[PDB]
């Protein structure tokens, strides 16, 4: 009684549908391995969350600049721009901080509920009871979302499909920067100016 991504299409046996967003869409038969499904769901969560973060960080500056509130440079040349700190130094700081963060995440994934305790101050005790959703004061301050059964399903579906939308949108933005030398919203303006003569087939 669960809608499928394709009407009248039989869902894969392993794709039960209990997990949020499971619409029986696995054409490549990739997730049939017993040990791969958890890795797939965690990877999709991380991918969608970082993709939507990057989607905000890309779309908001260009939109604000074209409105007029801000006067920030574009994303596809920001790396080659004047900064107080050297680019390599910043990158090393980034990789170190992310090494700590993901190391914690990887330890959580491999060993369930093993790194919920803060070493320096053992009086924190993260509250998350599911892998990939640690919650806690640092990551879930207000406490929204956590409720009864079938309440988490709809909001997690919202999260995963919003992340999918943002991820495909950011792929589109990168493809734009590869094909046109201007921001995607300016391409929206161009598509609005002459819609029947401005599309993908026009200047492929």
Partner 1 sequence: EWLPGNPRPSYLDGSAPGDFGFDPLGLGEVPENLERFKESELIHARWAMLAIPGVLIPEALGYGNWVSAQKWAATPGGQATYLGNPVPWGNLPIILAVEFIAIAFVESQRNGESDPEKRKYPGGPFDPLGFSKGANLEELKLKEIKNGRLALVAFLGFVVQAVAYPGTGPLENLKTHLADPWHNTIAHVLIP
In the complex, the residues that contact partner 1 under the rule CB under 8 A are 84-92, 107, 110-111, 114-115, 117, 119
Contact criterion met (CB below 8 Å) for 12 and 32: yes
Rounded to an integer, what distance in angstroms lies between the CA atom of residue 198 and that of residue 192?
Answer: 8
Q: After which residues is the chain broken (C to N over 2.5 A)?
A: none
Binding range to ligand CLA, per CB under 6 A, among 4-12, 22-30, 109-117, 137-145: 137-145
Residue selected from 67, 69, 120, 200 as contacting ligand CLA according to rule CB under 6 A: 200
Nearer to partner 1, 123 or 203 (CB): 123
Under rule CB under 6 A, residue 139 binds ligand CLA? yes
Alpha-carbon distance of 71 to 100, in angstroms, equals 34
The 3-state DSSP class for residue 119 equals: coil
C-alpha triplet 36, 42, 47: angle, nearest 5°: 120
Distance CA 204, CA 200 (A): 5
20 binds ligand CLA (CB under 6 A): no
CB of 164 to partner 1, least distance (A): 32
Contact pattern for ligand CLA over residues 40 through 69, marking x by CB under 6 A: ---------x--xx----------------
d(CA 132, CA 45): 7
Residues that bind ligand CLA (CB under 6 A): 49, 52-53, 128, 133-135, 139-140, 144-146, 155-156, 159, 162, 168-169, 171-172, 175-176, 179-180, 184, 187-188, 190-191, 198-200, 202-203
């Amino acid at each position: 009684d669960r809608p499928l991504w394709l009407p009248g299409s039989e869902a894969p046996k392993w794709l039960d549908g209990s997990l949020p967003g499971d619409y029986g869409f696995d054409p490549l038969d990739l997730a049939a391995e017993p040990g791969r499904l958890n890795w797939m769901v965690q990877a999709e969560l991380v991918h969608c969350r970082w993709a939507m973060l990057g989607a905000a960080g890309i779309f908001i500056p260009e939109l604000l600049t074209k409105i007029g509130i801000l006067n920030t440079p574009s994303w596809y040349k920001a790396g080659d721009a004047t900064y107080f700190a050297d680019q390599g130094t910043l990158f090393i700081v980034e990789l170190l901080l992310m090494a700590w963060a993901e190391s914690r995440r990887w330890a959580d994934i491999a060993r369930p509920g093993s790194v919920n305790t803060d070493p320096i101050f053992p009086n924190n005790k993260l509250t998350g009871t599911d892998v990939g959703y640690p919650g806690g004061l640092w990551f879930d301050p207000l406490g929204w979302g956590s409720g009864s059964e079938d309440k988490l399903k709809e909001i997690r579906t919202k999260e995963v499909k919003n992340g999918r939308l943002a991820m495909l949108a950011v792929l589109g933005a990168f493809v734009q920067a590869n094909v046109t030398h201007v921001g995607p919203i300016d391409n929206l303006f161009a598509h609005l100016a002459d819609p029947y003569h401005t599309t993908i087939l026009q200047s492929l």
